[PDB]
Amino acid sequence: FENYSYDLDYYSLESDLGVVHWVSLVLYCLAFVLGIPGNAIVIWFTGFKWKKTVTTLWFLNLAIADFIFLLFLPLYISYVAMNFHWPFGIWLCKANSFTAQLNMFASVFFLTVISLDHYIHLIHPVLSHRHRTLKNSLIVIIFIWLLASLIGGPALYFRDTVEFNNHTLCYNNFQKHDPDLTLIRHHVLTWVKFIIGYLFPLLTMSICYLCLIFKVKKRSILISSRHFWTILVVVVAFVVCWTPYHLFSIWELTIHHNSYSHHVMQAGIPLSTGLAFLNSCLNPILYVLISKKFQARF
C-alpha cells in the first residue's frame, strides 16, 4: 500500500476562485478542410513558369506560411477541444507558439509587401523598372523571414506550462522571473506586436489600395470593373478577421469593472482566433486561383 516513496512529491493548484464553443470548432474544421488541401494544390501546381518573376515568389511564400500555420492548427484545435487542457510538454507548446508567431507575421508582412509592390508597379513606371530584380526579391524575402523570426521572446523565458485545477495548461508568463518586471514586459510586447503586425501593415494596405483604385493612375487600359471589386473584397477579408484578434490581444487590461467583465474565459477569443485562421486560409484562394491571369492553364 504505497503511493509514493520516502520523498513525498506532487503538485496541485486547486483553487475555487456551448453556443460559442461549438461554432469555434466548426470554423476551425472548415478552415482546415478548405486549407491544407487547397494550399497543397497551390504549392504543387504553382509551376506556371520556371523561375518566374517576383509575384510567384510572393505567392509561394504566402502559401508556405499558410500551409505551415494550418498544419500546426490541429494541435491548437486538440488543445481547445479538450476543455482547455494541454497534456503535451512545455517544449512542444513553446515550439508551437514560436512557429505560430513566425508564420502569422510572415504572412502579414508578405501581404504588406505584395500591396507595396503593386502600388509601386502601377503608379511608378520608371523607378519600378530598375528595382524589380529577382535578387532584390530574394533579399527582401530573406529580410522579412529574419524579421518575423527574430521578433518577440517566446524562447522559453516568456512562456511556462503550469497545471491549473485538474487541467494542465501552457501559457505565456510575463512574470515570476523577476519582481522588477512588473507591467513592463506584458504590455510592451503586446503593443509592439500590435504596432508591427497590424498597424503599419493595415495602414500601408489601406493607403496603397485606396490611392490606386480612386485615382486609377489617371490613365486608361486598366480593367476597373474586376479590379475594384477584388481590391475591396481582399481589404474587407483582411480587416474583418484580424481586427477582433488584435482588439482581444490589446484587451489584456484586467481592470474594467471586475476580474474579467468580458467573459473571455469562453470561446470568444478562440472564435476570433478561428476567424484569423479563416482569413489565413482564404488569402491564397483569393489571390492566386481567382484572378483572370490564371485559370487559363487548367
Binding site: T53, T55, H121, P125, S291, K293
Partner: peptide, 8 residues
C-alpha cells in the same frame, strides 16, 4: 509589364 506581373 502588366501583361505578365499585373495581378489586379
Amino acid at each position: 509589364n502588366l501583361k505578365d506581373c499585373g495581378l489586379f
